[PDB]
Design a protein around this nucleic acid. Structure first.
Lengths: 197, 172, 191, 106, 136
RNA sequence: GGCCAGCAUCAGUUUUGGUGGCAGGAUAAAUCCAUAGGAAUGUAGCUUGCCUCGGUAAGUAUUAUAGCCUGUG
RNA sequence: AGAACUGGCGAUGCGGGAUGAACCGAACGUAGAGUUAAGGUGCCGGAAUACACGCUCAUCAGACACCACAAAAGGUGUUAG
RNA sequence: GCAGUCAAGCGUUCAUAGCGACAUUGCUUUUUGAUUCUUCGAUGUCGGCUCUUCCUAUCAUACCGAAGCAGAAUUCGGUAA
RNA sequence: UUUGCUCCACACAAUAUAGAUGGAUACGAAUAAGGCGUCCUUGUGGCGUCGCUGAACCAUAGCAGGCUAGCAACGGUGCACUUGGCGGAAAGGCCUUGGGUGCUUGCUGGCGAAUUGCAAUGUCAUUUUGCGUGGGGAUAAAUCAUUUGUAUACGACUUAGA
């Protein structure tokens, strides 16, 4: 219900994460997807490996440039599973997509804001315990995208830059928590209970 | 087939003026309404006695309710079912509350594992087993044991909104 | 049919300590520390008291129970690994060509060097897996013996040395030359 | 009271349509904060007004409005059928539209 | 340094578990399992909460941290009686859980006027708290 | 004395709820009560025997600080 | 290629079968409103990622007629008898 | 043309190393036919030279497994174009 | 090269706007596991609590916000300065030092807002483009033509020339 919805990508299914996004982009709800390389796919690591190559070789014969492209990056392999859902030929599906922006890891502006999840996506609430899964990073790093470890570095960086944060944020609430209870018992506190709050 | 009702039906044939009072008959039909009972009834006469709806009549149609919805009961069920490769006997046991819902639990089964439609599945009989320890299969024997305790692993709760900010867990 | 719930029993002798948090399994004993991650296999641990610790699966299927079982056998093989220890007696087998086995330090990584195999001109080399020290047996001619902690260490490195000796495109039922894992022992002399 | 919205905001959406046909006379409106039509009966008859900025100024005003009212619920998810004096331009999909509270059936 | 195997401690279905029903024609009443059938559908009665004896799927029901022990297959007349001295109700209204449900149910029934009152009183409070954290 | 509007009351066509009344049903079945019998995935209680002063392994034992089932009402 | 009892297509649109004259429902003066058939109910498409019980993981899965492919034989793979 | 299923026998002894009749189920279009649905107000019709590309039911090479494989030579098969 | 050009304010029109109307209200990891607190030998620690949906937390009373009074606190803020530190994955931000000016519904006050005439967005969100006004800051390049060739079909490329 907010101007720019920031979806965190960890713990999601490439299929069922995009399916809700494709509709949330036709309602005029802006989205920026972040931390893609931890996104997941049903089935084992080897299936997706050959879910892919058989699409990797589909390039048009008489010239390779103008054939169907193949994007190795962790983003686009999601962004390809998305742009198919939206129908983009008529101008609606074109200007509709620029509501959407995809990223790997996190970009500079959009880490500072609260990062959400979609209840019906997560690998934890769908797949059966004991079933396998595939980390899209593990996939795209193997099928010829490059930079994963360099992205894994920045993640292993900002986690620390956000670590000192949470302490200063929590320790602040530690004051306010009992300070929420230091004003209790008062004649106004008895009424808020009768008033429900 | 639907939420069921266990019907009894009594056919008397049609008396000829030479023959008053035929011996009647009655069968316990599992059907989803008044009519489907009557028809599914006549189906069992034609394959037993030569008589059929043309020469027949129905005395009464009376729903039956379980006299004890209270107690959990163990139902042995003999099932003759036609299928692709031939016809076969079965004996499957059901742990279910009442006779009329005990059969509904069965079509969900027999139309899953053995791929038989409602058209192809007769019900030969339904009977409760008095004492335990007379039970056949393990999977009915499974729950007869003393004071069962189990957790439900890996909870899920149906969600309404398309966004939930808290990273919902399975704790339970 | 989903057998409702089952369980197995792990048992701990006095001087060894399991530590299980999440599904991570630590072990500490006379032979040192072992660590293992079972998180892929989804089981629940029950600790009654020390020597009695029960593993259980609820509402699972055939395969899932089949996984519980081997989880038992795994962790228990670690425990009896950290008391006893693991030792493999391998004996050399050679016909006309004696096989040289050096131990060589190369960048401190402990490479086992095999020379004169089948009188070949090639040099053979294998990395030693971590934790396993290797001895050459006294008063047994042409024997090499491996000593280590976990079963995967000793077993994996041992068998790897076994399969470095394959013969190439000769008869495999005539030339028997090679190195073979024969007797699987435990490090301590008694057991 | 820095929020002066007296209207329930809502997002315009696709026309009444089959797969290969659409009928512009009945637009669909999705209302924020609604789930089932059993809940959504309260919004029936509430007059809707689409508000779009313009280029020319007429009637001494730089902004124009197309009035319209709700007919009935659409599907289980609370999507709402809406008519108008004149069908929406179709240039608006996912554009916001204002549901006034009047007439109040309360 | 002992085992230190921690918990993974579930609440457990058992004969006598007391269940909360949040969906269906009952929707928000306490009940208690009579005797469990199988992995899913169970038999329950809430007798003081009004829900009759019946079979119910687990998807419709939620388990509560409260418990009281029962003989298997106990009849409803017995369920009210074992229900009685177990102090089950006060247990239930005592948990913060039921306090939330009762709280919000008591919220959405506020007239707009008392909403206004809540506004003014929350300003009354927010001032005293803004003071309250300066010194400490 | 033209156009666009709104409101009220009607009318036709219809959809959305509420909500009462009455009849059917093995003149509902159940739950609930009186009522006897019968079993145990046998509670009390008994006792052996293991067992840190308590918990326990066995049968007795069909109701005792549980109860359920089977019937007739 | 050749015939029989019907029905269609030619001489006929519309919705569905992605698409296609003979498939399914239906036979159109022009508007309005309402309710349905066939088909569907992840997203592209409007509509329940609705409920229930189950069964299957496939290092060439399956996906609903006419419609556009598959067999003989094997497998303590698995599930039920 | 190719691929199976079973197996009497041959294969020293010996159905199965390799053969493989007797039958028997399929696949392919690369021949040759059947049909003639489309083009006689014309799609220029054999082969060669030329030049890429593709499918493998791979001839050689990489890596292996069986052999009636001692070595050598050779045969049968798999991942592979 | 008509005194143009860039930057900043003002001021005015136009010019449009895939489309505001309280707040995008910042840990990581597991989820057959955790968060939150408390205690210690600080641990793959203890003890308590909590999570079953943001149906929340903060903000939210003043003609779009009027005008003066008083009560307590020394807060919350508004604006513009300062203070220093931090920020590179698309840092253009965060946090902060000290002030100044303004509001205060934290509490009690006074007067006005009625004819927009029984509703009609009732227009107070923005980008852009231009124009005058105002104050700073600067005051050159490229192509053609000539010319070479390691460049060459013609363009392109590479040279050279106060």
């Amino acid at each position: 219900v907010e101007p720019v919805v920031v979806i965190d990508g960890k713990g999601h299914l490439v299929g069922r994460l995009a399916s809700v996004v494709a509709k949330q982009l036709l309602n005029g709800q802006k989205i920026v997807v972040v931390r893609a390389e931890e996104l997941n796919i049903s089935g084992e690591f080897f299936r997706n490996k050959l879910k892919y190559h058989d699409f990797l070789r589909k390039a048009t014969a008489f010239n390779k440039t103008r054939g169907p492209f193949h994007f190795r990056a962790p983003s686009r392999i999601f962004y390809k599973a998305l742009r198919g859902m939206v129908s983009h030929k008529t101008a609606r599906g074109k200007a509709a997509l620029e509501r959407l922006k995809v990223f790997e890891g996190i970009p500079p502006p959009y880490d500072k804001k609260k990062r959400v999840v979609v209840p019906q996506a997560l690998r934890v609430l769908r797949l059966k315990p004991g079933r396998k899964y595939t980390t899209l990073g593990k996939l795209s790093t193997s099928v010829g995208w490059k930079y994963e470890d360099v992205v894994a570095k920045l993640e292993a960086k900002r986690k620390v830059s956000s670590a000192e944060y949470y302490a200063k944020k929590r320790a602040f609430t530690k004051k306010v928590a009992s300070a929420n209870a230091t004003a209790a018992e008062s004649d106004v506190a008895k009424q808020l209970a009768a008033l429900g709050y | 087939m639907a939420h069921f009702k266990e019907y009894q039906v009594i056919g008397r044939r049609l008396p000829t003026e030479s023959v008053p009072e035929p011996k009647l008959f009655r069968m316990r039909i599992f059907a989803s309404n008044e009519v489907i009972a009557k028809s599914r009834y006549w189906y069992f006469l034609q394959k037993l006695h030569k008589v059929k709806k043309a020469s027949g009549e129905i005395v009464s149609i009376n729903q039956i309710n379980e006299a004890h919805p209270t107690k959990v009961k163990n139902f042995g069920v003999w099932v003759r079912y036609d299928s692709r490769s031939g016809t076969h006997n079965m004996y499957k046991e059901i742990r279910d509350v009442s006779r009329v819902a005990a059969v509904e639990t069965l079509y969900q089964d027999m139309a899953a594992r053995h791929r038989a439609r409602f058209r192809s599945i007769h019900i030969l009989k339904v009977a409760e087993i008095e004492k335990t320890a007379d039970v056949k299969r393990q999977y009915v024997k499974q729950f007869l044991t003393k004071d069962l305790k189990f957790p439900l692993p890996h909870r899920v709760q149906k969600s309404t909104k398309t966004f939930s900010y808290k990273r919902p867990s399975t704790f339970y | 049919m989903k057998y409702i719930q089952t369980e197995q029993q792990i048992e701990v002798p006095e001087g060894v300590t399991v530590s299980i948090k999440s599904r991570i399994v630590k072990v500490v004993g006379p032979r040192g520390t072992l660590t293992k991650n079972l998180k892929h296999i989804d089981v629940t641990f029950t600790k009654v008291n020390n020597q009695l610790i029960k593993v259980a699966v609820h509402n699972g299927g055939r395969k899932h129970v089949a996984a519980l079982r081997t989880v038992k056998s795994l962790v228990d093989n670690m425990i009896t690994g950290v008391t006893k220890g693991y030792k493999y007696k391998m004996r050399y087998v050679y016909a006309h060509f004696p096989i040289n086995v050096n131990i060589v330090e190369k960048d401190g990584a402990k490479f086992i060097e095999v020379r004169n195999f089948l009188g070949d001109k090639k040099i053979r080399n294998v990395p030693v897996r971590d934790g396993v020290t290797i001895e050459f047996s006294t008063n047994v001619k042409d024997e090499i013996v491996l000593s280590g902690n976990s079963v995967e260490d000793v077993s994996q490195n041992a068998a790897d040395l076994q399969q470095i000796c394959r013969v190439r495109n000769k008869d495999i039922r005539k030339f028997l030359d090679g190195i073979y894992v024969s007797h699987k022992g435990f490090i301590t002399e008694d057991l | 009271a820095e929020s002066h919205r007296l209207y329930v905001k809502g997002k315009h959406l696709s026309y009444q349509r089959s797969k290969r046909v659409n009928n512009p006379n009945v637009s669909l409106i999705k209302i924020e904060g609604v789930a089932t039509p059993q809940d959504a009966q309260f919004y029936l008859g509430k007059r809707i007004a689409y508000v779009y900025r313009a280029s020319k100024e007429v009637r001494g005003s730089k902004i124009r409005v197309m009035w319209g009212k709700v007919t009935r619920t659409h599907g289980n998810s609370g999507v709402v059928r809406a008519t108008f004096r004149n069908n929406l331009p179709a240039k608006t999909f996912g554009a916001s539209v204002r549901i006034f509270l009047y007439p109040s059936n309360i | 340094t002992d085992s230190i195997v921690k918990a993974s401690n579930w609440r457990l279905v058992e004969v006598g578990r007391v269940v909360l029903i949040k969906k269906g024609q009952s929707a928000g009443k306490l009940a208690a399992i009579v005797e469990i059938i199988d992995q899913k559908k169970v038999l329950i009665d809430g007798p003081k909460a009004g829900v009759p004896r019946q079979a119910i799927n687990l998807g419709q029901v939620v388990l509560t941290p409260l418990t009281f022990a029962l003989p298997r297959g106990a009849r409803t007349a017995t369920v009210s009686k074992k229900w009685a001295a177990a102090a089950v109700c006060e247990k239930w209204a005592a948990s913060s859980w039921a306090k939330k449900i009762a709280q919000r149910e008591r919220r959405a029934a506020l007239t707009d006027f008392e909403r206004f009152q809540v506004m003014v009183l929350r300003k009354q409070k927010r001032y005293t708290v803004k003071k309250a954290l300066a010194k400490a």
